[PDB]
Amino acid sequence: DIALVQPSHQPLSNDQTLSLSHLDNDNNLHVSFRYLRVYSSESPSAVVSASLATALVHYYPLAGSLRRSASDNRFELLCSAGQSVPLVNAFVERLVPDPTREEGMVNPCILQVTMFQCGGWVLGASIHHAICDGLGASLFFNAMAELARGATKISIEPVWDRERLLGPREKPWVGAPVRDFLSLDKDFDPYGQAIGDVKRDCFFVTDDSLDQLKAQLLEKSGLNFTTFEALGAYIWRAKVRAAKTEEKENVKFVYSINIRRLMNPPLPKGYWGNGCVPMYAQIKAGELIEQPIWKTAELIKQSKSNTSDEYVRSFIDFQELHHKDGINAGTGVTGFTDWRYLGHSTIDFGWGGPVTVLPLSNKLLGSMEPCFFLPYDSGFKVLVNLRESAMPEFKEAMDKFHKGEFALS
Amino acid sequence: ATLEITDIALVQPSHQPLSNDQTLSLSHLDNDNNLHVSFRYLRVYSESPSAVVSASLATALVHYYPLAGSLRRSASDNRFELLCSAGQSVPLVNATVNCTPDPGFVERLVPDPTREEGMVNPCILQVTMFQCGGWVLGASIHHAICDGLGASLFFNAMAELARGATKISIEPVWDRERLLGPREKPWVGAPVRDFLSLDKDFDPYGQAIGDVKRDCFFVTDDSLDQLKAQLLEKSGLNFTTFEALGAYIWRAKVRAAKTEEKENVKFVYSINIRRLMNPPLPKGYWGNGCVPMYAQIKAGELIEQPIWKTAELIKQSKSNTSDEYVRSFIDFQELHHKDGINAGTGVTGFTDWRYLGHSTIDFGWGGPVTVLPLSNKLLGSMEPCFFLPYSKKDSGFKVLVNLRESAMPEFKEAMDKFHKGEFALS
Numbered sequence: 072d073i074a075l076v077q078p079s080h081q082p083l084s085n086d087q088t089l090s091l092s093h094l095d096n097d098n099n100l101h102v103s104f105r106y107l108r109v110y111s112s113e114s115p116s117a118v119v120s121a122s123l124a125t126a127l128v129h130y131y132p133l134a135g136s137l138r139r140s141a142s143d144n145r146f147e148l149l150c151s152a153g154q155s156v157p158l159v160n161a162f163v164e165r166l167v168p169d170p171t172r173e174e175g176m177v178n179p180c181i182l183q184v185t186m187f188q189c190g191g192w193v194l195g196a197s198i199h200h201a202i203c204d205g206l207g208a209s210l211f212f213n214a215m216a217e218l219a220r221g222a223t224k225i226s227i228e229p230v231w232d233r234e235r236l237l238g239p240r241e242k243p244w245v246g247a248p249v250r251d252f253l254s255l256d257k258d259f260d261p262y263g264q265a266i267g268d269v270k271r272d273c274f275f276v277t278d279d280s281l282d283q284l285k286a287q288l289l290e291k292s293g294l295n296f297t298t299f300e301a302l303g304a305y306i307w308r309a310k311v312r313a314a315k316t317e318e319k320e321n322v323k324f325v326y327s328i329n330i331r332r333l334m335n336p337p338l339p340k341g342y343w344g345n346g347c348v349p350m351y352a353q354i355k356a357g358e359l360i361e362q363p364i365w366k367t368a369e370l371i372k373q374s375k376s377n378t379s380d381e382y383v384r385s386f387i388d389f390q391e392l393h394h395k396d397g398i399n400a401g402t403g404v405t406g407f408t409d410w411r412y413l414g415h416s417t418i419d420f421g422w423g424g425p426v427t428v429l430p431l432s433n434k435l436l437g438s439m440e441p442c443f444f445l446p447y448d449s450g451f452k453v454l455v456n457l458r459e460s461a462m463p464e465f466k467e468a469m470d471k472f473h474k475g476e477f478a479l480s
Numbered sequence: 481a482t483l484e485i486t487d488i489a490l491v492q493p494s495h496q497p498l499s500n501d502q503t504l505s506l507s508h509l510d511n512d513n514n515l516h517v518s519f520r521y522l523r524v525y526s527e528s529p530s531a532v533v534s535a536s537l538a539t540a541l542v543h544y545y546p547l548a549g550s551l552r553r554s555a556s557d558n559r560f561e562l563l564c565s566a567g568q569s570v571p572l573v574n575a576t577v578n579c580t581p582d583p584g585f586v587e588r589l590v591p592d593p594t595r596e597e598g599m600v601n602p603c604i605l606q607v608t609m610f611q612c613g614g615w616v617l618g619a620s621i622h623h624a625i626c627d628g629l630g631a632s633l634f635f636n637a638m639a640e641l642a643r644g645a646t647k648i649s650i651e652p653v654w655d656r657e658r659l660l661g662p663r664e665k666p667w668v669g670a671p672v673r674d675f676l677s678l679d680k681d682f683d684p685y686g687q688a689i690g691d692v693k694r695d696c697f698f699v700t701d702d703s704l705d706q707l708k709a710q711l712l713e714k715s716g717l718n719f720t721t722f723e724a725l726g727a728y729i730w731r732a733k734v735r736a737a738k739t740e741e742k743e744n745v746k747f748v749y750s751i752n753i754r755r756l757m758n759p760p761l762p763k764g765y766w767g768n769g770c771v772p773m774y775a776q777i778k779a780g781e782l783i784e785q786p787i788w789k790t791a792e793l794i795k796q797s798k799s800n801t802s803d804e805y806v807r808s809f810i811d812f813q814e815l816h817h818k819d820g821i822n823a824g825t826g827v828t829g830f831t832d833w834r835y836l837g838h839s840t841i842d843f844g845w846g847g848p849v850t851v852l853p854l855s856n857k858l859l860g861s862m863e864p865c866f867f868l869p870y871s872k873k874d875s876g877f878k879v880l881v882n883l884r885e886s887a888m889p890e891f892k893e894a895m896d897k898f899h900k901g902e903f904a905l906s
């Protein structure tokens with residue numbers, strides 16, 4: 072059973088093509104991001120279709136179709152009256168739609184509500200990553216949630232204005248910290264690498280294992296690292312090691328940061344497009360599998376150095392210059408995404424906050440083996456997508472961690 | 481920069497006091513639309529604070545378990561009710577930092593829920609640990625749950641338990657719909673009718689005034705004494721610092737805002753009505769126990785009338801403080817909750833913090849060396865101002881003003897003339 076939800080009240084009089092920002096049109100984001108929310112305890116089917124319909128008054132672009140435009144290969148978003156977001160009513164893979172490129176450009180936002188008699192239900196979503204980032208999506212979902220809870224109007228009104236706020240410079244200019252991560256190769260597909268079948272697996276990590284880990288890196292290097300730095304170091308090393316990567320292959324650690332607060336001037340509060348740029352560390356595989364973790368952890372710590380206004384403006388301008396030319400960060404890229412402490416909590420439709428949340432996409436940040444830190448004696452889940460050949464050695468690495476045999480050099 | 485979040489503890493009551501669910505109704509003061517906001521403040525100080533606050537919290541939650549609960553709109557009337565259930569928790573964000581006061585950094589010290597998101601988690605604490613046995617306690621409480629004094633009952637109860645107390649010394653009183661209920665034949669007097677108005681389409685906190693900046697001003701006990709002595713010389717009346725300086729700030733801010741000459745502007749503050757009701761509210765009552773008082777004038781009059789007149793207007797506003805004023809305000813809410821009760825545009829809220837009991841919130845590390853409010857939405861104002869407590873010539877307090885970005889240059893100039901004692905009294 073699949074309901075085609077249109078806006079409650081119709082906002083568009085005549086058609087409307089919006090362009091997307093230079094961050095939106097990054098080739099790494101030509102993918103459908105797939106995730107699901109679980110909840111316990113009018114039915115959730117009905118409650119989310121009503122939220123959806125009223126939020127679509129303000130978020131009507133999600134209803135729209137992406138296409139390529141003949142002048143360049145950039146996406147623009149066609150919006151027209153009659154457009155609708157599909158709501159599917161209803162192993163884990165069947166819980167959120169898996170649209171192919173065409174279906175994903177045709178329906179860049181697709182929701183699914185699976186109820187089963189065991190109280191709970193699941194909300195699945197398949198949003199094309201060019202439309203928006205995780206903060207953007209979460210503006211959209213908190214807006215639906217708040218409307219479900221009886222809100223009078225949406226509390227933050229969404230801002231488009233994308234080609235204006237995140238456009239290129241009239242005289243484009245790209246700095247060394249962008250040029251040194253990236254390369255041009257029209258013939259390279261970050262997501263088409265022959266690495267065998269990619270598995271998904273989950274590992275619990277205890278707040279106490281991490282504190283052990285930081286205390287020892289501190290004793291041996293006099294720096295305190297963040298969980299992200301220390302644990303990311305450890306997972307990166309373990310991954311590259313298990314993939315038996317050739318010693319002189321350049322490997323990379325990539326993560327996404329929110330730049331909204333950091334621009335001059337800051338981005339609007341209502342801004343729901345892509346408002347993240349990828350940050351990197353790179354090193355030879357051999358150096359990584361054999362240097363101490365404190366060095367690798369330090370290398371990641373130093374990468375947020377490049378978090379600045381100019382770094383973002385460089386990245387955009389690089390895309391102006393080379394969109395048609397195959398921009399990529401090459402092979403050996405591992406993506407990492409921190410999810411531990413977003414506000415999952417407030418996407419409350421009536422049934423409380425989601426008891427667990429789960430990303431299914433394994434193509435992200437120009438990686439095929441992206442890793443995610445998922446929300447909460449105490450500890451959190453680490454999800455790793457890793458090629459099948461590497462996964463047994465990797466399980467053993469996480470089991471050594473679990474037992475605090477960290478192998479620090 | 482580099483503030484981590486080490487973890488988020490979901491603290492439950494020590495012992496769980498509900499068997500199954502429980503909806504509590506809130507008072508018609510609690511459900512005032514101007515209170516549908518989060519109040520955000522932090523306390524600065526110099527087993528760990530993290531562990532000691534979580535254990536206090538857990539044992540207070542035996543008596544204060546509604547802080548754990550979720551605000552929803554009722555199926556009958558669209559007022560907030562508070563759903564309480566076993567499982568429910570107060571979030572404690574534990575976080576750490578080193579390294580270089582900075583405006584939008586201080587924002588990270590306490591969570592920043594939107595009004596609607598704040599209903600899901602109406603009570604959020606944050607313990608940010610710092611170098612050399614120093615830390616910050618941040619709090620984001622939905623204003624419908626409780627007021628200043630109410631929170632302060634809750635925090636002193638945590639603190640006394642931290643100091644080794646056998647039990648909490650005052651049992652909190654709910655009983656809200658009964659003690660602050662409306663009259664069987666609601667009746668609303670002209671002192672309330674004249675401040676408030678009805679517009680379902682009006683958002684006190686959604687007006688288009690631009691970005692709102694926050695800035696702090698030191699004001700010397702000596703500048704104020706010059707200020708009172710001169711108002712006295714020129715009118716023979718004695719004004720409090722709240723009257724004289726409030727006058728001055730209000731005029732300077734309306735003037736800086738270039739406000740149209742026949743706009744009605746207002747000066748609003750909140751007063752504790754606990755001791756004033758008949759009968760009084762019980763001591764353990766921790767909901768909202770305050771009503772706003774106002775003074776109003778056309779903007780043109782305020783920017784050009786002498787200060788002593790404006791200070792007089794504010795001194796005369798506490799006239800309206802009575803039992804009946806409260807019962808009028810409540811009954812106006814009974815009548816017109818559904819119809820958009822508001823005090824309109826041009827309201828500047830003021831809050832005096834100089835003589836409350838900050839210092840008994842003592843967890844182990846003494847009382848807080850300084851305290852700081854972050855919310856800029858309060859009293860139906862988008863530009864609230866706060867007088868902050870004390871730690872001859874150098875002695876004084878900080879005045880914190882939330883003012884739209886376009887007006888803040890002219891306002892700085894105004895406080896600089898004050899600092900130098902160029903008061904321009906007419």
Ligand SMILES: COc1cc2ccc(=O)oc2cc1O
Pocket residue numbers: 519621622623626627628629630631632831
């Ligand atoms: C207890 O948390 C609060 C603290 C204060 C303090 C001053 C004020 O203006 O209002 C408050 C509302 C609150 O919910």
Ligand SMILES: [Ca+2]
Pocket residue numbers: 250251252253254
């Ligand atoms: Ca390069």
Ligand SMILES: [Ca+2]
Pocket residue numbers: 673674675676677
């Ligand atoms: Ca009126």
